[PDB]
Amino acid sequence: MRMSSGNIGVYKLDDSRVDYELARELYQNKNANYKLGSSFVRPIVNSTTGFMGVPHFQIEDEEAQYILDEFVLDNTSKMLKTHTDSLKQGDCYIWITREERENPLYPDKKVRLIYNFISPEEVKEIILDPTTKEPIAYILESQNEWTDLGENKRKAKVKQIITAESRFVEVEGDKIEGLEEGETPNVWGFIPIIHFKNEADETLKYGQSDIEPIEPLLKAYHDVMLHALKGSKMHSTPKLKLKLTDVASFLAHNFGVEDPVKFAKEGGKINLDGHEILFLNKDEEAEFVEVKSAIGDAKELLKLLFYCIVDVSETPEFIFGVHTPSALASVKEQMPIMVNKIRRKREQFTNSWQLLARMVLIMSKYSSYDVTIGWDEVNPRDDKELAETLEKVCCALDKALEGGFISEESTVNFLAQYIDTMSNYISDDGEREGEREKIIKTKML
Amino acid sequence: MRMSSGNIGVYKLDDSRVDYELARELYQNKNANYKLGSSFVRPIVNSTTGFMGVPHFQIEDEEAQYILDEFVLDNTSKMLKTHTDSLKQGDCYIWITREERENPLYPDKKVRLIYNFISPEEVKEIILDPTTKEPIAYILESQNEWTDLGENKRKAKVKQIITAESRFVEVEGDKIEGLEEGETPNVWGFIPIIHFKNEADETLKYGQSDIEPIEPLLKAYHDVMLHALKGSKMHSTPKLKLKLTDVASFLAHNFGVEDPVKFAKEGGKINLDGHEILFLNKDEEAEFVEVKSAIGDAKELLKLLFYCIVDVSETPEFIFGVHTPSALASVKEQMPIMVNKIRRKREQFTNSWQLLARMVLIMSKYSSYDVTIGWDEVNPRDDKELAETLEKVCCALDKALEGGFISEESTVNFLAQYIDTMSNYISDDGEREGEREKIIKTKML
Amino acid sequence: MRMSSGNIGVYKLDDSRVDYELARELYQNKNANYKLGSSFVRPIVNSTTGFMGVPHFQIEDEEAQYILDEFVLDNTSKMLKTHTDSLKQGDCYIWITREERENPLYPDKKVRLIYNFISPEEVKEIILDPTTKEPIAYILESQNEWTDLGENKRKAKVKQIITAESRFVEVEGDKIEGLEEGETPNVWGFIPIIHFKNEADETLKYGQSDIEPIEPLLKAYHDVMLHALKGSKMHSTPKLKLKLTDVASFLAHNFGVEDPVKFAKEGGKINLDGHEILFLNKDEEAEFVEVKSAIGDAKELLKLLFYCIVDVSETPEFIFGVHTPSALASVKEQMPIMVNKIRRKREQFTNSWQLLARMVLIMSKYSSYDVTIGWDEVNPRDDKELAETLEKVCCALDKALEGGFISEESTVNFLAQYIDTMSNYISDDGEREGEREKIIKTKML
């Protein structure tokens, strides 16, 4: 809607966050006022998270690539959990920590880069640079109640500031052995905590959960559903009606209810087996009092709400073919829409994953740190078709030889692309299988 | 829903558990309050735990690979049971114990690693590291009520704390031969139990069963079905009706019910055959009183609940093709949804399986301890198609020879992948066929 | 449903077993309260038992394989019997016994390893080690009533404790010549009985029958069907109604019934041929008292119960294509669901079959006892496609010869796989055919 240039307010960054507890309730379908309506929260998030894979950290430096694929082999599942937590909660905070601790469970692995999650509830506030907008400190706070290795109960309200040059930690309550109170220097001059920001906006400080647009529609669907269920349970079964000369004598003779009022107060419910008959006088009349459809128009409204919910999330409708089975005829036909959605979504996080890869390389001299990220195939590229292209290019090449020696570069690049596509296993997430095959090939020689 | 950042409480990890007895009863359809509604539990869990097989522990070391595939041959069934347990209860526990006990039933396998299970009801609490959330002690408790080899009954309550440094065990009851009471040191400095976590959440302590979101929907389905069935049995059959001039004379003459109040109070019932004719006087009338629909509008609500339940589980629709026969038109068309779900689901446990592989290698020098995990084929590629890819690569290769000798690495890698895919038998669990053929080939030479 | 950590009881292993006699009644459809409902018990069990074949005992030692295929050729039928008995009853106990007895029916076979069944009713109780949970002693008890080779009737209450070191047998009543009373030493240090445990659980002592989840649904279906049949027989036929000026004179003139009351007491049923005509006066009126549908809504509820029962058993719909004929359009499309189900089920028993194979090897020096088990093809692997892969790999091989001599190993392994698949006859159960062909080839030379 139009507005005049002189009737606008001043910009103000949005410090508001998602109701993380409510979001996790709706993902688990636990909130009482959304249980029926929150059925669609799980499929959208699960499908979106599954269809986008994990970042393929590609770097031209050999050692940097080795370190990156080591981290991937360590923490691919945690990367997937980062994706789903960022989508579900909007903000998922990842901490990478360097630990040199010795334990027998890691005989060869002396030093570990620990992929440590931080729940969004832990981050009470983030210090932002007014000018460059790079975060300057993280005010982590959490209640850490825990049990002793014997029997004692131990409570502690721990909070800690994480700054680039150092981190300041203090605890109120019982001793925590692993944490050293006071300030400790940071081994590097940057904060190792990467904040993934789902659905980030230039006018917002935090990330956004994908549930938030559809939540009022979940409320409407839940309210309509519970109203329909209540009305059905009230009036679906027909209410047999008897017009009797004498109700009291009737009840007394049939079922021995001498005190009908007391029977009503006592919740007295009469036993009917099903094969009954009505022996009535001339003027006595018995009829069923029945409704055509106790639901009313609720089915059409629920259908409309389902369509609106699908539209808001713009998910391809083979996810929700239970409502529309005909969409399942060609899911491959629907796959390009999923490709569009996943392409749009991967750009939200690929920058943060570049930052995380850069920090991982820094936390373990390389010729470069500018990682470029590939992604898993939404719909797999056919290896037979790719090999057909390879053979067709090869036979096309080596003919009309005036083209030059760039044919060799094109052929080796295409061979590398085919090798990457085929070695990666379509049913297996990520590119851990490629690194595994490379390691096995190197060892076997 | 949005909220101002400064109006949220303190983070606290949730120690709550899943109702395990209720979960397994619903899985067995035993709960009276959920007998009708629990019909959807089994197909969800079974399809999920089946369409993923078992992890394929890959390691470049020959000795480690031999240990791992021997372990797989031993406990593939128990690993599938672990998958089922994790999907059902939400939290599963595995306890590998190295036993050198000699019995004639294993003349050759003197030393055995006993893949033993711990119920989620066995464990009373887990002691976690406050700084890393790593388990530092397991709190087990259980009653061993058993029968003596004679005719005596033995009631034994045993509690045992397992720690990385030692294992403590005490029994309050009759003696048990196998257990040495008190603290016994652990031969290795790590806890020999692995805590599997289904649907892992950062803020939770125990994994979440996938039944939990659908439980309100199962309750609603049971309520609707029970109400509909009761209403039908009450009213679905018609109720004949006789408007007579004098009921009591009619009863006395025809059916011999001389005292009708006694007959009704006594619960007596007249017999009929159906082939009856009504001879009535003029004033009296006799008509049927019948219901347009005893169920009312229950079928649409049941369909809606079924749709919501399938959406919550995000299960493929061919799993419930009875409700939607159109879904059975092309199961392979819906298979990519299953592949996506399995891709998302395998990562929930692959980290714990890596930990198990690392430990069992430790429990029984090796050049590596970082096991990279493969998996069974969700939608296995045609061996004819794979051979087409191999032949097409081979013909494309060995032409335009400027590429180099990397063609050898590419083709041997592709041949290894082809051997893995072809030897891996699709219709049998795991890769016991590959190891079996390898061992038989080695013996045959 | 969720619950707090400190509000759980102490774990107890469940000693409950299946109501075995009730289960065999429902499989035979003999239980009065389940005859109509238990129609679905038979197809589920039969389909599951058929679609999974018999274990393919594979071992790399030649003599061990020879003994295993001898046992297979002897007892494939009894192994299928073991499968179906475990499926129906939940717990089927197998006894392997060694008998040297001479009889002319076995001229060349002096010593026989008898495949002897034990019904679950015979096993009163099983002694368990509290630590390793291995069965330590079987308390078999059974009444053996039998007849003489002449005319005498014989009765004997026999029970026998079977332990690893020895088995102790006693009889109460008439003599049993074949059984030597008192203790007799065991030839080996393990019990000669194997327990197959369907649907075993770590919280359950015994197995469970797959009828048990559907049993309440069987009750509901039976009750609804019986109520529907009763209502139909009561009211489906129309009840001709006559409003008569003088009913007594009417009856007397039509059918000579001088005393209508006595006719009613005598069960007097009038004879109507069908081609009747009513000559009524002006006042008199005759009408039919007919119902739109005496059933009401029972068909919809029965359909819902059928869907729920199918879902609980998660059987592919071509087993029940009679209710949904459209599922039979492509059973091959439904075959992967059966593959998934059979893969899941085979893991329940393959461990016990490995135990039985090892034990058969022990009771008849070998280089190994760790038998690996294959299984029959759910849907057959096409021999034409397999040969296409063989030819395609062979032509792909022997080109770009830098790959090495591993091509020979790959080719011989693929040839062995093809030979095993083709020699085994699809329409005939088991792998007796491969052993028979091998024996015939060896003899013919």
PDB file of N, CA and C in Angstrom, chain B residues 224-250:
ATOM      1  N   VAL B 224     -12.661 -41.770  18.796  1.00  0.00           N
ATOM      2  CA  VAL B 224     -13.640 -41.703  17.714  1.00  0.00           C
ATOM      3  C   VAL B 224     -14.131 -43.099  17.357  1.00  0.00           C
ATOM      4  N   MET B 225     -13.203 -44.047  17.205  1.00  0.00           N
ATOM      5  CA  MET B 225     -13.588 -45.395  16.806  1.00  0.00           C
ATOM      6  C   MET B 225     -14.441 -46.054  17.882  1.00  0.00           C
ATOM      7  N   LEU B 226     -14.074 -45.870  19.151  1.00  0.00           N
ATOM      8  CA  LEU B 226     -14.841 -46.465  20.237  1.00  0.00           C
ATOM      9  C   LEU B 226     -16.249 -45.893  20.281  1.00  0.00           C
ATOM     10  N   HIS B 227     -16.370 -44.569  20.159  1.00  0.00           N
ATOM     11  CA  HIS B 227     -17.689 -43.949  20.194  1.00  0.00           C
ATOM     12  C   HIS B 227     -18.536 -44.417  19.019  1.00  0.00           C
ATOM     13  N   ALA B 228     -17.935 -44.491  17.829  1.00  0.00           N
ATOM     14  CA  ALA B 228     -18.672 -44.938  16.654  1.00  0.00           C
ATOM     15  C   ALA B 228     -19.128 -46.383  16.808  1.00  0.00           C
ATOM     16  N   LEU B 229     -18.242 -47.253  17.294  1.00  0.00           N
ATOM     17  CA  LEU B 229     -18.592 -48.659  17.460  1.00  0.00           C
ATOM     18  C   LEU B 229     -19.706 -48.826  18.482  1.00  0.00           C
ATOM     19  N   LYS B 230     -19.624 -48.092  19.594  1.00  0.00           N
ATOM     20  CA  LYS B 230     -20.667 -48.180  20.608  1.00  0.00           C
ATOM     21  C   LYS B 230     -21.998 -47.682  20.062  1.00  0.00           C
ATOM     22  N   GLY B 231     -21.981 -46.554  19.349  1.00  0.00           N
ATOM     23  CA  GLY B 231     -23.213 -46.041  18.773  1.00  0.00           C
ATOM     24  C   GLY B 231     -23.814 -46.988  17.754  1.00  0.00           C
ATOM     25  N   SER B 232     -22.967 -47.622  16.942  1.00  0.00           N
ATOM     26  CA  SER B 232     -23.455 -48.581  15.958  1.00  0.00           C
ATOM     27  C   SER B 232     -24.080 -49.792  16.637  1.00  0.00           C
ATOM     28  N   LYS B 233     -23.365 -50.394  17.590  1.00  0.00           N
ATOM     29  CA  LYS B 233     -23.909 -51.551  18.293  1.00  0.00           C
ATOM     30  C   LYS B 233     -25.184 -51.188  19.044  1.00  0.00           C
ATOM     31  N   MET B 234     -25.310 -49.924  19.451  1.00  0.00           N
ATOM     32  CA  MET B 234     -26.513 -49.479  20.141  1.00  0.00           C
ATOM     33  C   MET B 234     -27.685 -49.310  19.181  1.00  0.00           C
ATOM     34  N   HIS B 235     -27.435 -48.750  17.989  1.00  0.00           N
ATOM     35  CA  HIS B 235     -28.497 -48.241  17.127  1.00  0.00           C
ATOM     36  C   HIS B 235     -28.413 -48.654  15.664  1.00  0.00           C
ATOM     37  N   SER B 236     -27.298 -49.226  15.198  1.00  0.00           N
ATOM     38  CA  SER B 236     -27.154 -49.507  13.770  1.00  0.00           C
ATOM     39  C   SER B 236     -28.232 -50.467  13.287  1.00  0.00           C
ATOM     40  N   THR B 237     -28.449 -51.550  14.019  1.00  0.00           N
ATOM     41  CA  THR B 237     -29.568 -52.419  13.707  1.00  0.00           C
ATOM     42  C   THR B 237     -30.872 -51.664  13.969  1.00  0.00           C
ATOM     43  N   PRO B 238     -31.904 -51.849  13.147  1.00  0.00           N
ATOM     44  CA  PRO B 238     -33.159 -51.143  13.408  1.00  0.00           C
ATOM     45  C   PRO B 238     -33.855 -51.708  14.632  1.00  0.00           C
ATOM     46  N   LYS B 239     -34.764 -50.905  15.177  1.00  0.00           N
ATOM     47  CA  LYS B 239     -35.561 -51.273  16.343  1.00  0.00           C
ATOM     48  C   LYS B 239     -37.025 -51.252  15.933  1.00  0.00           C
ATOM     49  N   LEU B 240     -37.629 -52.434  15.845  1.00  0.00           N
ATOM     50  CA  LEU B 240     -39.039 -52.527  15.504  1.00  0.00           C
ATOM     51  C   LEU B 240     -39.874 -51.855  16.584  1.00  0.00           C
ATOM     52  N   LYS B 241     -41.093 -51.471  16.219  1.00  0.00           N
ATOM     53  CA  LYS B 241     -41.946 -50.686  17.097  1.00  0.00           C
ATOM     54  C   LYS B 241     -43.396 -51.057  16.839  1.00  0.00           C
ATOM     55  N   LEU B 242     -44.113 -51.400  17.909  1.00  0.00           N
ATOM     56  CA  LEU B 242     -45.504 -51.841  17.845  1.00  0.00           C
ATOM     57  C   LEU B 242     -46.360 -50.882  18.660  1.00  0.00           C
ATOM     58  N   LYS B 243     -47.205 -50.113  17.974  1.00  0.00           N
ATOM     59  CA  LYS B 243     -48.191 -49.248  18.622  1.00  0.00           C
ATOM     60  C   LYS B 243     -49.487 -50.040  18.723  1.00  0.00           C
ATOM     61  N   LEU B 244     -49.723 -50.624  19.895  1.00  0.00           N
ATOM     62  CA  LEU B 244     -50.808 -51.570  20.110  1.00  0.00           C
ATOM     63  C   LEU B 244     -51.902 -50.967  20.983  1.00  0.00           C
ATOM     64  N   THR B 245     -53.051 -51.646  20.996  1.00  0.00           N
ATOM     65  CA  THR B 245     -54.156 -51.233  21.854  1.00  0.00           C
ATOM     66  C   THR B 245     -53.919 -51.639  23.305  1.00  0.00           C
ATOM     67  N   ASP B 246     -53.246 -52.766  23.529  1.00  0.00           N
ATOM     68  CA  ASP B 246     -52.920 -53.214  24.880  1.00  0.00           C
ATOM     69  C   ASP B 246     -51.687 -54.098  24.782  1.00  0.00           C
ATOM     70  N   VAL B 247     -50.560 -53.608  25.296  1.00  0.00           N
ATOM     71  CA  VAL B 247     -49.304 -54.338  25.152  1.00  0.00           C
ATOM     72  C   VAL B 247     -49.348 -55.647  25.936  1.00  0.00           C
ATOM     73  N   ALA B 248     -49.806 -55.594  27.192  1.00  0.00           N
ATOM     74  CA  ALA B 248     -49.651 -56.730  28.097  1.00  0.00           C
ATOM     75  C   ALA B 248     -50.403 -57.953  27.594  1.00  0.00           C
ATOM     76  N   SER B 249     -51.612 -57.751  27.071  1.00  0.00           N
ATOM     77  CA  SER B 249     -52.347 -58.859  26.476  1.00  0.00           C
ATOM     78  C   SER B 249     -51.579 -59.444  25.301  1.00  0.00           C
ATOM     79  N   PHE B 250     -50.962 -58.584  24.488  1.00  0.00           N
ATOM     80  CA  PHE B 250     -50.185 -59.066  23.352  1.00  0.00           C
ATOM     81  C   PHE B 250     -49.034 -59.948  23.815  1.00  0.00           C
TER      82      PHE B 250
END
